[PDB]
Amino acid sequence: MEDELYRQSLEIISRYLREQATGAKDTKPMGRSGATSRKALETLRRVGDGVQRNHETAFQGMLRKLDIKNEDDVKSLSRVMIHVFSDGVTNWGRIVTLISFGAFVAKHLKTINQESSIEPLAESITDVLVRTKRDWLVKQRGWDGFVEFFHVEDLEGGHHHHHH
Template sequence: MESCEFLSRFWEGKMSCWLSKETLVLAEDYLEFCVGVQRTPPGPASEAMRCLAKEIEKQNLSKFHSLVQTFLDSCGPDRSSSLRKVMAEMVGDGKLNWGRVVSLFAFTGVLVGELHSRGEGKDCCRRLAETIADYLGVEKQDWLLQNEGWDGFCKFFHSSRGQNHESAMKTALFAAAGIDRMKTRLCVW
């Protein structure tokens, strides 16, 4: 029985590491894409995230810019900790879904774009990508695994095209609107 427990913990650790690394690649690709780095997406999930998150951003640009300004005015120098609080707030009701994940990427993409325009280098992309990877790939690992990881995200993306696209976008827009609740909390932080 002990060897089974050891193997189970071993595979859980491997899975967590793999999922975290895959999430980091995805997050870093998207954030660098948001600051103008031109390269081929490293995989289908990155391509899907670029498409969906940018669509959400375009549809809610003024709201995202307002939220980013509030975030920057109140977060202080430790943006990663503040972003972690935003992520926790987005799923505070326990209902993580792909729409909320896309909204998180869209928000962070607008944030990185603003930081880049203020002269902050690529380091901010890496730090915030690591924060996303740690949160989604480690803390929300169980949810990601239950939803087939980033392959599941690709299925969501493809199923949301055409007939179901509007419904999937409404889910993501609803989650994006949930960031608005952050204004109150951001002022307190």
């Protein structure tokens, strides 16, 4: 029921959530795009951790009244995930914030034994991503554009904001 682009992104996000949940690094290969998914994953984990550090005090504020006890709560998280992009602006950092918050909830899920909820949660992250940022993903090469924007394997700058 997915797209090729959906499966690749789903795999990347799925791994990061499982790694954060298990408190360790995973062993699986990267989905579809060997290099793109690799560079995307390592960038996601390094910057996502930082986002969690500064945002943790904020996320816990909602997480306490959320507490996912079944997939239906994840379906509710989807509504929040949509609002995470409702800023109107671009900011690839929000893409990171989406996946980072997903991992932040995922680690809580494994803590409460709800690991089965983590995977459909990762699908929810990818679902909203592909639902609203579909065109941006392919047009700006999403993951390839993500790594240059945050300047990991980049040597130019990535930043080139133009409004019209």
